[PDB]
């Protein structure tokens with residue numbers, strides 16, 4: 001019928017969760033076409049002297065494979 | 069004695085995660101009483117030309133059954 | 136080699152998820168040294184008249200043991 | 202063929218686990234027909250001065266949709 | 269934005285897995301508007317003389333709340 | 335060294351959870367030796383006239399293999 | 402009360418999913434009595450020239466232990 | 470605002486499930502204040518000549534942190 | 537010494553479940569060699585006029601890496 | 604077509620992980636034919652004076668049924 | 671009855687998996703009494719010039735609470 | 738900020754678990770730059786005349802994406 005591929009990316013940001021998700025998808029958009037959906041798998045991060053240093057969101061990203 | 073019900077909702081927002089959760093709870097508040105707690109089950113969404121198009125937060129919402 | 140301990144905390148905030156996470160880490164920082172990493176286990180909360188009353192983020196917090 | 206619905210209920214009791222389960226089903230019985238099976242999803246509770254204050258059993262309850 | 273509700277149904281059939289899924293959705297459409305998607309949660313069933321007696325497919329069904 | 339075998343049993347009882355567990359273990363004891371440990375995998379059951387009809391505890395039972 | 406035993410089988414078939422499930426239950430009934438319920442744990446398989454080579458359905462099968 | 474901590478305890482009892490849970494909570498309150506909620510993570514145990522020897526209930530216990 | 541790669545694909549089809557799986561594998565076969573095994577991760581789909589519109593099978597596909 | 608059975612074994616060893624897995628398989632080999640594959644479900648063990656006393660590897664072991 | 675506590679440690683080693691487990695238990699042994707059992711939760715690590723740089727084993731360690 | 742990709746590899750070895758892990762990473766470093774971390778997802782394998790024929794370690798390998 002149709003075929004999609006999913007790739008597992010980790011987006012990171014010092015700002016917040018949305019920014020980390022957006023960083024992953026902004027990079028995905030540079031090389032992948034027909035990006036349709038995503039699913040958050042994990043939220044983790046690193047700690048520094050101010051609390052969160054880096055948010056890291058592990059994301060599956062689904063895109064439709066071109067037939068032609 | 070007391071009994072609670074949980075319903076599975078999906079709140080959506082183009083703005084962010086908190087807004088998505090709030091959308092679901094805003095809608096629940098119009099028809100349901102004694103809403104007590106929620107649990108996020110998953111965070112999903114759609115992708116558009118500018119990154120995230122829609123955040124979709126799947127929530128379970130618990131409320132006390134009256135009477 | 137090195138050994139880390141993980142403790143399960145729940146940070147709360149009326150304003151958002153990042154704020155809830157930061158609350159947990161801010162409290163951890165008062166008594167724990169060599170805080171390194173965190174993992175969100177669950178997002179929960181309470182409901183009030185204006186929707187979300189409290190965001191409650193269940194976190195694992197990893198720190199290096201001296 | 203036949204179709205069932207499952208509803209997620211939380212039964213509570215200050216007495217025990219069985220009593221919390223029975224509280225959920227006792228309430229379900231007041232308004233739902235053809236209740237058939239249940240599955241425990243979670244056992245939770247609250248703590249008080251004397252230990253457990255309330256047992257809280259999260260249950261999936263299945264009933265056959267009639268006609 | 270939009271809000272969706274998910275309901276957990278179990279479709280059954282003696283014919284097969286597809287028929288089981290269709291039974292739940294056929295019943296769902298008799299009362300629910302704006303049905304959009306489904307997610308299979310598990311496949312179970314009963315055993316008889318001939319092998320499978322009936323297939324039972326536990327489904328979550330999403331629809332938009334109007 | 336030692337090797338253990340785990341087998342999955344379901345005990346049932348109309349009385350309670352402990353009774354269901356004990357039923358599975360009583361049966362295991364009739365034919366197996368060196369029964370050491372158990373792990374509850376799920377709690378399910380049936381619904382009758384007065385709430386719970388049958389408690390059904392799915393149990394993994396571990397025993398040390400002889401030789 | 403009653404006691405059931407569950408066993409984990411893998412039914413295989415080149416035809417389809419139902420056929421793989423049926424293969425397990427058919428073998429089960431050759432030696433086991435009072436077979437009552439099954440639960441699919443996973444659907445796996447092998448790949449060949451024509452796509453799916455073999456469907457492999459991992460199944461839990463429950464039967465009532467006889468008392469006499 | 471508030472910060473809570475969860476500890477994983479295993480309550481045990483030769484009597485039953487509720488007793489194992491209560492045993493964990495009774496010990497917790499000897500030293501911990503602001504004990505609020507618990508969540509059962511698993512039910513395990515040992516087997517003896519009469520079936521269950523000891524029930525072992527793995528429990529997360531949540532309490533509010535002071536200061 | 538030898539190494540395999542797994543890739544997560546979603547096959548879709550309006551016919552049925554097997555057709556969805558075969559769709560993903562047929563495509564994989566056009567550009568990948570040494571395809572060996574698959575594992576179904578989930579079954580999802582869309583709803584239309586007459587019940588199921590599209591079956592969507594999420595599949596991991598494992599293949600041997602050359603050299 | 605072919606039918607396989609999977610049994611859950613716990614291999615143990617005071618030396619290491621691979622030794623514990625090999626212990627389970629060495630035992631399986633004494634009474635079962637067409638042993639094909641294994642799946643590690645869990646790594647557990649006991650603690651002694653010098654750290655690990657015994658490794659205990661919970662394995663599923665699959666074999667093809669004859670006839 | 672008795673009450674146990676479980677703590678989650680991450681043992682690390684450049685050598686191997688058993689070494690990482692042992693590093694965690696060695697540190698546990700310095701300050702904790704009645705260490706009884708462990709459960710491996712995760713195996714992960716870092717990558718360097720020669721492949722694995724450090725193995726990291728996330729472990730639950732159970733000990734009996736004294737007194 | 739930075740973006741990483743995770744790929745699922747299966748490393749194999751007749752020697753042991755660490756060798757299987759190292760086989761996957763050895764292959765990875767021939768074609769991928771900025772390899773950072775790994776997570777073991779599953780330990781599987783095959784059985785032969787002498788017990789374990791082949792250890793197969795299913796690994797997620799994470800690497801930083803360029804530019």
Ligand SMILES: CC(C)(COP(=O)(O)OP(=O)(O)OC[C@H]1O[C@@H](n2cnc3c(N)ncnc32)[C@H](O)[C@@H]1OP(=O)(O)O)[C@@H](O)C(=O)NCCC(=O)NCCS
Nearest residue numbers: 031032033034063064065066541742744746764765768769
């Ligand atoms: C290294 C890597 C991260 C780089 O990804 P990238 O920046 O997107 O670079 P790519 O070369 O993959 O570019 C995207 C390709 O997808 C194609 N493409 C984009 N969208 C597509 C779609 N919807 N359908 C089909 N093709 C599409 C592009 O045309 C391009 O191919 P082309 O250069 O032939 O035109 C990625 O290639 C990768 O993860 N490879 C797998 C590595 C691996 O697992 N190695 C084994 C280690 S042991």
Ligand SMILES: CC(C)(COP(=O)(O)OP(=O)(O)OC[C@H]1O[C@@H](n2cnc3c(N)ncnc32)[C@H](O)[C@@H]1OP(=O)(O)O)[C@@H](O)C(=O)NCCC(=O)NCCS
Nearest residue numbers: 166167168169198199200201474476478496497500501534
């Ligand atoms: C009660 C509790 C929440 C208080 O935590 P706290 O606010 O961090 O206070 P603590 O006394 O633990 O202070 C932190 C300690 O860790 C030490 N420490 C901080 N970082 C460390 C590190 N990286 N490595 C080693 N030690 C460290 C501090 O020096 C301090 O010890 P000290 O007072 O001897 O100098 C916490 O101790 C706890 O959860 N314990 C409960 C135990 C339990 O589960 N009880 C059993 C019930 S059945």
Ligand SMILES: CC(C)(COP(=O)(O)OP(=O)(O)OC[C@H]1O[C@@H](n2cnc3c(N)ncnc32)[C@H](O)[C@@H]1OP(=O)(O)O)[C@@H](O)C(=O)NCCC(=O)NCCS
Nearest residue numbers: 206208210228229232233266299300301302331332333334
């Ligand atoms: C009993 C039950 C299975 C019957 O379901 P049903 O056949 O669909 O019958 P319902 O009336 O509930 O469903 C149709 C309703 O949904 C409404 N509806 C349909 N699609 C809708 C949509 N997309 N958005 C909003 N409402 C919608 C219909 O208008 C109708 O409501 P109305 O009578 O006010 O007009 C169902 O009501 C149920 O599972 N609820 C039981 C509640 C429960 O859990 N009991 C508590 C036990 S303790």
Ligand SMILES: CC(C)(COP(=O)(O)OP(=O)(O)OC[C@H]1O[C@@H](n2cnc3c(N)ncnc32)[C@H](O)[C@@H]1OP(=O)(O)O)[C@@H](O)C(=O)NCCC(=O)NCCS
Nearest residue numbers: 073075077095096099100133232233234235264265266267
């Ligand atoms: C509010 C609520 C807790 C009340 O539950 P309740 O006490 O069972 O009340 P119900 O109206 O569902 O009563 C049971 C209904 O199911 C019907 N019914 C009972 N058993 C049935 C069966 N086996 N098959 C079909 N219908 C059945 C009854 O006829 C009755 O409907 P009717 O009065 O229209 O004839 C429950 O309906 C609910 O959880 N719905 C909330 C919907 C929701 O999720 N809100 C959206 C928020 S965004």
Ligand SMILES: CC(C)(COP(=O)(O)OP(=O)(O)OC[C@H]1O[C@@H](n2cnc3c(N)ncnc32)[C@H](O)[C@@H]1OP(=O)(O)O)[C@@H](O)C(=O)NCCC(=O)NCCS
Nearest residue numbers: 365366367368397398399400406408410428429432433608
């Ligand atoms: C059918 C079944 C439930 C009957 O169970 P049961 O009542 O315990 O009867 P068993 O024949 O297994 O008897 C237990 C045997 O194990 C022996 N045994 C008891 N404890 C033991 C131990 N710790 N170590 C080794 N052997 C032991 C007993 O002495 C007896 O052997 P024996 O009769 O040769 O003396 C059980 O054998 C079973 O589930 N078999 C698997 C069937 C199956 O999967 N079929 C495939 C269908 S596709």
Ligand SMILES: CC(C)(COP(=O)(O)OP(=O)(O)OC[C@H]1O[C@@H](n2cnc3c(N)ncnc32)[C@H](O)[C@@H]1OP(=O)(O)O)[C@@H](O)C(=O)NCCC(=O)NCCS
Nearest residue numbers: 140500501502503532533534535675677679697698701702
């Ligand atoms: C060993 C252990 C079980 C003893 O538990 P315990 O009997 O409850 O002892 P604690 O020191 O934690 O006692 C509770 C302390 O927290 C305080 N406290 C109690 N409730 C509190 C709360 N809600 N908020 C903050 N502090 C609290 C008590 O006043 C007491 O402090 P005090 O010593 O000043 O009187 C426990 O400390 C433990 O599990 N420690 C972790 C061990 C570990 O992981 N070590 C590293 C191994 S590598």
Ligand SMILES: CC(C)(COP(=O)(O)OP(=O)(O)OC[C@H]1O[C@@H](n2cnc3c(N)ncnc32)[C@H](O)[C@@H]1OP(=O)(O)O)[C@@H](O)C(=O)NCCC(=O)NCCS
Nearest residue numbers: 005007009027028031032567568569570599600601602742
């Ligand atoms: C876009 C995409 C789906 C296209 O896949 P495709 O149609 O199979 O095309 P690919 O080039 O990737 O795959 C075929 C290649 O694999 C090779 N190949 C096939 N089987 C192989 C095997 N067993 N071992 C090694 N290589 C093999 C083929 O020879 C071909 O390479 P070549 O052109 O150099 O000869 C795929 O490249 C992809 O998903 N890339 C990842 C994108 C990504 O994650 N980017 C990062 C975004 S942030």
Ligand SMILES: CC(C)(COP(=O)(O)OP(=O)(O)OC[C@H]1O[C@@H](n2cnc3c(N)ncnc32)[C@H](O)[C@@H]1OP(=O)(O)O)[C@@H](O)C(=O)NCCC(=O)NCCS
Nearest residue numbers: 339341343361362365366406634635636637666667668669
């Ligand atoms: C007790 C037990 C551990 C002993 O196992 P064992 O040492 O391998 O001995 P078994 O007799 O069971 O198995 C060996 C037999 O399997 C047969 N066998 C071996 N490989 C086979 C294959 N691939 N296909 C079919 N049969 C095979 C052999 O013929 C052999 O001898 P047989 O001719 O007498 O049947 C095991 O039988 C068991 O766990 N039984 C289940 C007990 C149970 O669950 N009881 C219910 C308690 S409530």
Ligand SMILES: CC(C)(COP(=O)(O)OP(=O)(O)OC[C@H]1O[C@@H](n2cnc3c(N)ncnc32)[C@H](O)[C@@H]1OP(=O)(O)O)[C@@H](O)C(=O)NCCC(=O)NCCS
Nearest residue numbers: 140142144162163166167474701702703704733734735736
């Ligand atoms: C900081 C930390 C790693 C240090 O661990 P440590 O090196 O093992 O030192 P601890 O004090 O925790 O543990 C040793 C204590 O437990 C006692 N103890 C050891 N084994 C015991 C057992 N089986 N039963 C009861 N007590 C025991 C020791 O006697 C000692 O207490 P003492 O000083 O009164 O003699 C640990 O205390 C910890 O993780 N604390 C929790 C901090 C926390 O979560 N704070 C909240 C931040 S928001």
Ligand SMILES: CC(C)(COP(=O)(O)OP(=O)(O)OC[C@H]1O[C@@H](n2cnc3c(N)ncnc32)[C@H](O)[C@@H]1OP(=O)(O)O)[C@@H](O)C(=O)NCCC(=O)NCCS
Nearest residue numbers: 005541543545563564567568768769770771800801802803
């Ligand atoms: C076939 C496959 C296993 C071969 O992997 P491989 O041996 O690593 O070969 P690649 O072609 O991917 O080589 C690595 C590429 O990534 C680039 N790369 C390496 N590290 C990188 C990094 N950190 N960031 C960006 N790019 C990187 C390399 O420069 C090289 O690209 P180049 O040839 O343009 O220089 C792999 O490409 C694959 O699994 N493809 C996906 C197949 C697929 O899903 N097809 C769809 C089937 S329906």
Ligand SMILES: CC(C)(COP(=O)(O)OP(=O)(O)OC[C@H]1O[C@@H](n2cnc3c(N)ncnc32)[C@H](O)[C@@H]1OP(=O)(O)O)[C@H](O)C(=O)NCCC(=O)NCCS
Nearest residue numbers: 099100101102131132133134206273275277295296299300
């Ligand atoms: C379509 C649907 C979502 C509409 O939800 P809704 O917008 O909340 O509309 P409702 O009719 O359920 O309104 C809420 C009801 O719950 C009642 N209610 C609110 N809070 C309550 C509480 N805490 N305790 C008991 N009842 C409560 C309200 O009084 C109202 O009932 P009333 O009209 O008798 O006064 C629908 O309720 C639903 O999803 N039900 C199940 C549909 C289903 O699964 N059908 C089977 C298909 S196969």
Ligand SMILES: CC(C)(COP(=O)(O)OP(=O)(O)OC[C@H]1O[C@@H](n2cnc3c(N)ncnc32)[C@H](O)[C@@H]1OP(=O)(O)O)[C@H](O)C(=O)NCCC(=O)NCCS
Nearest residue numbers: 339432433434435464465466467608610612630631634635
């Ligand atoms: C090899 C094996 C697959 C053969 O299975 P099988 O073809 O069904 O052969 P069995 O010998 O088990 O025959 C079924 C038995 O269950 C009995 N049985 C069938 N249904 C029953 C039921 N409902 N209640 C009680 N007993 C029943 C049959 O009568 C027969 O026993 P009997 O020969 O004493 O009359 C075997 O059953 C097995 O998997 N055993 C476990 C092997 C094992 O784990 N060994 C340890 C390895 S380290």
Ligand SMILES: Cc1cc2nc3c(=O)[nH]c(=O)nc-3n(C[C@H](O)[C@H](O)[C@H](O)COP(=O)(O)O)c2cc1C
Nearest residue numbers: 445446447457540570572573574600747781793795
């Ligand atoms: C991790 C992994 C999982 C596998 N799962 C299955 C399986 O589900 N069913 C099956 O028949 N074979 C399975 N196999 C075996 C492969 O399909 C294949 O036959 C074997 O790896 C030999 O492949 P090769 O000739 O490409 O090296 C699996 C192999 C690996 C490494």
Ligand SMILES: Cc1cc2nc3c(=O)[nH]c(=O)nc-3n(C[C@H](O)[C@H](O)[C@H](O)COP(=O)(O)O)c2cc1C
Nearest residue numbers: 411445457605607637639640641667781782783793
């Ligand atoms: C459900 C299942 C899982 C399997 N998993 C693996 C695997 O983990 N690794 C592997 O190399 N082969 C795997 N296989 C392949 C078997 O090891 C075996 O080689 C194959 O089933 C051929 O079986 P037979 O020779 O007994 O007929 C798997 C097969 C099945 C049916």
Ligand SMILES: [Cl-]
Nearest residue numbers: 341407408610
């Ligand atoms: Cl068996």
Ligand code: NA
Nearest residue numbers: 648649656657
């Ligand atoms: Na032991």
